[PDB]
Ligand SMILES: [Ca+2]
Ligand SMILES: [Ca+2]
Ligand SMILES: [Ca+2]
Ligand SMILES: [Ca+2]
Ligand SMILES: [Ca+2]
């Protein structure tokens with residue numbers, strides 16, 4: 051049913067310590083088997099316990115707390131607190147707390163008049179052990195002025211939902227999803243935090259980040275990452291819609307993650323790249339609107355690259371792989387580099403650099419002057435002993451504007467296709483033009499590229515860089 055904190059002695063006056071009163075309301079609601087702890091408008095001061103892991107208030111299974119609205123019900127930390135406090139509202143470590151939530155209320159960490167690391171909302175069970183909180187909701191909650199992490203749901207929580215909420219002016223990250231599972235962050239705003247807007251980390255997976263907005267943060271608008279430990283990477287991370295703008299680092303940064311997707315977002319005004327992808331296995335970058343990034347310097351609106359952790363905790367080298375980059379509007383350069391397996395890589399209006407690496411890739415540059423790089427003869431080839439597969443195709447090569455960068459491959463020029471020359475050929479129905487090495491290597495492979503369309507007469511020697519000197523003369527981008 052309903053429990054009003056005032057009926058348990060809570061004053062809501064901005065000066066009395068209401069911790070024990072609100073906690074009494076919570077314990078009564080839990081002992082009845084579940085209930086709504088109700089708080090009328092006011093500022094309720096709260097204080098911590100003997101240890102950081104006590105937090106301030108302990109929410110419990112089947113208890114929901116409903117305020118009078120963001121800005122109207124404010125739970126605020128007392129002046130003078132000088133001890134690390136991990137969760138102004140939190141569940142208990144070492145207990146599987148479930149079917150609880152907070153709505154229509156503000157948590158104020160009062161960093162101006164306190165010292166020590168404070169987190170707003172903390173969930174989860176026990177780091178490095180199996181077990182989870184589950185069915186956790188925060189609706190229309192505002193978390194502000196904590197010295198560290200605003201929303202800090204933590205390892206492990208399953209079916210966390212945070213919606214229609216706001217984190218601002220927190221000392222580090224507005225939102226952390228630490229080992230969250232099968233969870234949802236929707237229509238939230240995270241702004242003017244000391245470091246990240248949203249930070250999904252520590253093995254989190256099956257996460258939907260829909261229509262969130264992040265601006266004015268000291269670092270990334272959104273970062274999805276493994277973290278500093280040698281643990282399972284996050285995976286199945288779907289970012290849909292929303293806006294990541296005017297941040298101190300990249301708009302969206304994804305690193306050491308598997309099967310991530312970023313679609314339909316507006317990404318602008320960031321100091322670093324709009325989107326940066328580092329060592330991501332399965333990346334979809336679809337239908338975004340990306341402009342005016344790299345305000346702090348830098349040559350690229352989009353960066354795909356590897357993540358070399360060989361000298362770090364895992365000892366591993368992580369390629370970006372399995373990438374699909376399509377339908378984006380990109381007012382500046384895209385660096386689209388991938389590796390083994392089939393990549394679909396589309397540039398936009400900028401002067402882009404495209405290289406699908408090993409396997410059979412489909413590349414398009416769009417407008418501007420783009421460089422399609424082929425770094426190894428085994429990255430686009432045909433073996434007649436078996437399939438034409440493994441031959442890359444360029445969709446829209448534009449003679450006079452685009453460039454084919456073969457500068458590392460050791461061919462001398464166009465010719466009959468032997469002796470280190472490449473032959474320019476048209477297939478039978480005139481739908482594809484090939485550059486071909488007619489000399490098989492020892493495995494029977496022929497370096498070969500397809501250009502979609504008929505370019506046997508339009509293409510010329512100045513469209514291909516055959517060595518580093520030519521590449522310096524002809525290169526179309528700042529990115530090499
Ligand atoms: Ca718990
Ligand atoms: Ca302080
Ligand atoms: Ca590839
Ligand atoms: Ca382009
Ligand atoms: Ca182009």
Ligand SMILES: [Ca+2]
Nearest residue numbers: 407408409429
């Ligand atoms: Ca390739």
